[PDB]
């Protein structure tokens, strides 16, 4: 419709500012005390019946040998994962496809790099204990660091896995990231090879238990091996983990129709129509929505999604970030933040006088009739206003 596709335009623009304002990548820092790196990241797991389970990761990497290593400046890795099932497999199993790419240093090789120039066989061995429920996982596949590509099949060798597969993905080889030519001096992971590194994590599942991991990642001959011990404590008997309430698969399906909604939202930011979004342009939309960021914040927000590191959001970089932002569910707190962009008085209801103060402050002419058509489209209980539960309907597939 002509008032339906005025929701998507305004809604996508807000979800996009949401994405630009959060921290979704794997942030790496030098740790000179340990001759190593530290990392941290927020992972999302879709809850089958709706909502999201967050898993907050802290990470530490330590060389096994005394060789010199590369200690990087601050960057991040960007990871895209697809989970699938092997149709001829009786055993509890996971087929995993990962792409891993290093970015985050805008445009201004160790001996280990050389072991990754081609396709490297991969072996993974995990022993686990969560709340006393013990399990082992075996995996095999191969990695191509040229393209940051990993393929792996994993078996549960103990029978039924006591936790959902998706919760083990982060634990079950960042030495296969594609690093740009300008960032090769920052690849610690390959630098440690072949003697290897210790990778330790702690993973906090919000409102539930935590995992502790210790892994040896090294060459055993010509194979890259990941040997992992995992311990989980304090999990709820009927939480999302132990009660197996998380989506396995997470559809990867952007319709032609959705891409086109992304473009219309994109064009709100790209006011000069040159196919990219500058700090100036991002700033302009955000001031117009109340917020008032610095040049420094805008550079950081753009850096979160700047694949090519040119200091702008290219249309493709935008399509990518919006794709991700539809694959994984937002938190209540994130949707709340979205709502408050419309809900200026904080009373918990979007008036028709609130929707306009957004729309005519975002450079849109519209009669006090098409406004009322917007409200009507979203308003189920009929009060002529938009409450939180109503908003949450507008902001979904
Ligand atoms: Ca532009
Ligand atoms: Ca760019
Ligand atoms: Ca209000
Ligand atoms: Ca209502
Ligand atoms: Na163990």
Is 390 assigned to a binding site? Answer: yes
Q: If you ran DSSP here, which 8-state letter would residue 326 be given?
A: H
Is 312 assigned to a binding site? Answer: yes
Single out the residue of 2, 15, 80 nearest to residue 394, CA to CA. Answer: 15
- Alpha carbon of 245 to ligand 2 centroid (Å): 37
Nearest ligand atom owner, CA of 213: 5
Cα-based torsion angle of the residue sequence 300, 304, 307, 310 in order, rounded to the nearest 10 degrees? -10
Is 343 assigned to a binding site? Answer: yes
In DSSP notation, 41-58 reads EEEEEEBTTSSEEEEEEE
Measuring CA to CA, how many Å separate 200 from each of 60, 77, 231? 5, 17, 12
Q: If you ran DSSP here, which 8-state letter would residue 310 be given?
A: S
Single out the residue of 138, 142, 144, 161 nearest to residue 152, CA to CA. Answer: 142
Is 368 assigned to a binding site? Answer: no
Kindly give the interhelix angle for 370-378 and 352-359, rounded to the nearest 10 degrees.
120
CB 295 within 8 A of CB 91: no
d(CA 299, CA 321): 16
| 128 burial level (CB within 10 Å; 0-12, 13-18, 19+) | buried
Kindly state the tokens that stand for 326: 């539809």
Kindly state the tokens that stand for 289: 């929505």
CB 41 within 8 A of CB 169: no
- Alpha carbon of 336 to ligand 3 centroid (Å): 13
d(CA 379, CA 284): 30
Estimate to the nearest angstrom the gap between the alpha carbon of 280 and the chain centroid: 26
The H helix count followed by the E strand count for the chain is: 10, 13
In DSSP notation, 89-112 reads --S-EEEEEEEEEEE-S-----TG
387 φ, ψ (degrees, to nearest 5): -85, 180
Classify the C-alpha dihedral 129-133-134-136 as positive or negative.
negative
Residues near 164 by beta carbon (within 8 Å), at least 6 away in sequence: 45, 240, 241, 244, 246, 248
d(CA 28, CA 135): 30
Residues near 330 by beta carbon (within 8 Å), at least 6 away in sequence: 15, 18, 52, 338, 395
Using only C-alpha atoms, the chain has a radius of gyration, in whole angstroms, of 23
Measuring CA to CA, how many Å separate 292 from each of 33, 247, 265, 284, 285? 38, 38, 20, 9, 10
Instruction: Provide the 3-class DSSP secondary structure of residue 307.
Output: coil
CB 17 within 8 A of CB 285: yes
**What share of residues in the chain are helix, strand, coil (percent, to 5)?**
30, 30, 40
Length of the chain: 397
Single out the residue of 182, 175, 36 nearest to residue 114, CA to CA. Answer: 175
**H or E element: which one contains 238?**
none
Kindly give the interhelix angle for 352-359 and 5-20, rounded to the nearest 10 degrees.
70
Residues near 356 by beta carbon (within 8 Å), at least 6 away in sequence: 366, 368, 371
Locus of tokens 């599942």: 205
d(CA 318, CA 305): 8
Is 308 assigned to a binding site? Answer: yes
Nearest ligand atom owner, CA of 268: 1
CB 156 within 8 A of CB 207: no
Is 354 assigned to a binding site? Answer: yes
Region at 207 (left for phi over 0; alpha for psi -120 to 50; beta for the rest) = left
Kindly state the tokens that stand for 387: 């409450």
Kindly state the tokens that stand for 193: 């090879």
Measuring CA to CA, how many Å separate 205 from each of 58, 63, 175? 12, 28, 25
- Alpha carbon of 69 to ligand 2 centroid (Å): 30
Nearest ligand atom owner, CA of 284: 1
Residues near 217 by beta carbon (within 8 Å), at least 6 away in sequence: 173, 175, 189, 196, 197, 199, 224, 225, 226
- Alpha carbon of 307 to ligand 2 centroid (Å): 6
Kindly state the tokens that stand for 143: 């990695």
- Alpha carbon of 7 to ligand 4 centroid (Å): 16
d(CA 390, CA 384): 12
Instruction: Provide the 3-class DSSP secondary structure of residue 199.
Output: strand
């Amino acid at each position: 419709d002509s008032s339906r596709r005025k929701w998507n335009k305004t809604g996508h623009a807000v979800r996009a500012i949401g994405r630009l304002s959060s921290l979704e990548n794997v942030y790496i820092k030098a740790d000179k005390q340990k001759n190593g790196i530290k990392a941290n990241f927020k992972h999302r797991h879709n809850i089958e019946d709706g909502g999201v389970q967050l898993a907050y990761h802290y990470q530490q990497n330590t060389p096994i040998g005394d060789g010199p290593v590369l200690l990087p400046d601050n960057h991040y890795l960007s990871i895209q994962s697809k989970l699938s099932k092997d149709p001829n497999e009786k055993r509890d199993h996971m087929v995993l496809l990962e792409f891993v790419t290093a970015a985050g240093i805008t445009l201004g090789v160790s001996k280990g790099e050389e072991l990754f120039t081609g396709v490297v066989p991969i072996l993974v061995e995990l022993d686990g204990d969560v709340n006393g429920h013990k399990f082992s996982v075996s995996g095999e596949g191969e990695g191509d660091a040229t393209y940051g590509k990993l393929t792996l099949k994993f078996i549960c060798t103990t029978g039924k896995l006591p936790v959902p597969w998706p919760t083990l993905v982060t634990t079950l080889v960042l030495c296969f990231s594609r690093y740009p030519d300008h960032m090769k001096q920052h690849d610690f992971f390959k630098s440690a090879m072949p003697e290897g590194y210790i990778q330790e994590r702690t993973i906090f599942f919000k409102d539930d238990g935590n995992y502790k991991t210790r892994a040896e990642v090294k060459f055993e001959g010509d194979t890259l091996v990941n040997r992992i011990e995992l311990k989980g404590i304090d999990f709820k008997e009927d939480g999302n983990i132990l009660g197996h309430k998380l989506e396995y698969n997470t559809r990867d399906q952007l319709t032609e129709e959705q891409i086109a909604e992304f473009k219309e939202a994109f064009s709100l930011f790209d006011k000069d129509g040159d196919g990219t979004i500058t700090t100036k342009e991002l700033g302009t939309v955000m001031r117009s929505l109340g917020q008032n960021p610095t040049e420094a914040e805008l550079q950081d927000m753009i850096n979160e999604v700047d694949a090519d590191g040119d200091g702008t959001i290219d249309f493709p970089e935008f399509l990518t970030m919006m794709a991700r932002k539809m694959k994984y569910t937002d938190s209540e707190e994130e949707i709340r933040e979205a709502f408050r962009v419309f809900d200026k008085d904080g009373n918990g209801y979007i008036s028709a006088a609130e929707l306009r103060h957004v729309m005519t402050n975002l450079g849109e002419k519209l009669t006090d009739e098409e406004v009322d058509e917007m409200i009507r489209e979203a308003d189920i209980d009929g009060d002529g206003q938009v409450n939180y539960e109503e908003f949450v309907q507008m902001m979904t597939a």
